[PDB]
């Protein structure tokens, strides 16, 4: 199969600036008829994908001229000039030369914001949940920018990888920040085998981790 | 006008057969050069092309689904069908049909999609738990429900600013999410903060008042 590799997968831009998205096919997508069937689609939230570009550089009718495609060989580029808010969403390249037809993984065009450290809060399992034999430990990492962040759970000072599920909010339409939850789910038996619980966040806003902890025995 | 309209069963159990319909208007599959394809998207994930059918009955399939796919058409009724046998959780997705033509060789027209959940889960109400701590952050954990969605409000909607309700995630066939709210420390606990959680499918509504923790 032809693999379509897009770069980057997340693209922050200031309004009015130009965005450039790369798409590379793992092998030639020149059809025997001589055309290169590379298309670009844009999917806005809650909508079906919509066609932007076909055959590398041809704009579909109705598409603003600020969208332009180019390329050669197996290297393709979508340029979006003077980015507007309405342009935000996920861009996909797509080759239709070879079966199976294949899309790139998608590039999310997003907004730039001012740097902000996450506000970190940790919460022990509730007494209500513990009565039922479960123990979820929750950590919120709220309103941060930029998007990248490293979150670790530590139990009695040691990293805990198993039982952790993370969830992320969409970029905030007001302040352009991100938020995430991290939830460590244990059995009560597991929970009661240790006393110190820590949620640790490392973010580019500081060389020092943000560390929030609680001790079970004080609860 | 050219339109495509997908329909499907909405929800299936693992092992069942999926039968999708694409009802179109504004063109005919009797017209030379005409074709329709199916593309799906698992939520929060990317697009995958599945199958394609041409006006002259040529059909193309994605090998990634093996002998599970069958595409067909009824030009008389302006419909294209996709059958997927032996569904499993990975078939949970939004399914789109889209048109291409020889003279307009690209997916210019797509349907709005039909969404499919594949699950063996039974309807289950959430367990709602308090998350107790200048500003202060409180929360509520909404655990172990099916199907989506739940609605979470704070103080019966009066507390709307400073709220983050996170997307649900799957845990052993059941959904879980949390909601956080941030308020001035001068308003809690002096004034009450309560999360209200509704899960329509299980006929449940619960309120959880947040009270301060000791650890």
């Amino acid at each position: 199969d032809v693999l379509m590799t897009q770069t980057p997968l997340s693209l922050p831009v200031s309004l009015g600036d130009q965005a450039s998205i790369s798409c590379r096919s793992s092998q030639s997508i020149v059809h025997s008829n001589g055309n290169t069937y590379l298309e670009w689609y844009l999917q806005k939230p809650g909508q079906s994908p919509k066609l932007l570009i076909y055959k590398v550089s041809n704009r579909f009718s109705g598409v603003p001229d600020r969208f332009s495609g180019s390329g050669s060989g197996t290297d393709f580029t979508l340029k979006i000039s003077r980015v507007e808010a309405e342009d935000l969403g996920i861009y996909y390249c797509f080759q239709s030369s070879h079966v199976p037809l294949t899309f790139g993984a998608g590039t999310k065009l997003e907004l730039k914001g001012a740097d902000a450290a996450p506000t970190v809060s940790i919460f022990p399992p509730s007494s209500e949940q513990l009565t039922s034999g479960g123990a979820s430990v929750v950590c919120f990492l709220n309103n941060f920018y930029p998007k990248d962040i490293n979150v670790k759970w530590k139990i009695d000072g040691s990293e805990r990888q198993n039982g952790v599920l993370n969830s992320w909010t969409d970029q905030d339409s007001k302040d352009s920040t991100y938020s995430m939850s991290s939830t460590l789910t244990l059995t009560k038996d597991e929970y009661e085998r240790h006393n110190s619980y820590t949620c640790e966040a490392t973010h580019k806003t500081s060389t020092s981790p943000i560390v929030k902890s609680f001790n079970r025995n004080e609860c | 006008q050219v339109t495509l309209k997908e329909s499907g069963p909405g929800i299936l159990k693992p092992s069942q057969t999926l039968s999708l319909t694409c009802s179109f208007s504004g063109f005919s599959l009797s017209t030379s050069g005409m074709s329709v394809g199916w593309i799906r998207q698992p939520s929060g994930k990317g697009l995958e092309w599945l199958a394609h059918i041409w006006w002259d009955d040529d059909k193309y399939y994605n090998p990634s689904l093996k002998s599970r796919l069958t595409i067909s058409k009824d030009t008389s009724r302006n419909q294209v069908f996709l059958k997927i046998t032996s569904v499993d959780t990975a078939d949970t997705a939004t399914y789109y049909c889209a048109r291409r033509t020889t003279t307009a060789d690209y997916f210019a027209y797509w349907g709005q999609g039909t969404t499919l959940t594949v699950s063996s889960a039974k309807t289950t109400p959430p367990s709602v738990y308090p998350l107790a701590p200048s500003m202060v952050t409180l929360g509520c954990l909404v655990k172990g429900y099916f199907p989506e969605p739940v609605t979470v409000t704070w103080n019966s909607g009066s507390l709307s600013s400073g709220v983050h309700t996170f997307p649900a995630v799957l845990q052993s066939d059941l959904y879980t999410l949390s909601s956080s709210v941030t308020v001035p420390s001068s308003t809690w606990p002096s004034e009450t903060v309560t999360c209200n959680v509704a899960h329509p499918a299980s006929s449940t509504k619960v309120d959880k008042k947040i009270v301060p923790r000791d650890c």
Partner: peptide
């Protein structure tokens, strides 16, 4: 395998 593009 090439897709159809007449």
């Amino acid at each position: 395998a090439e897709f159809r593009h007449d």
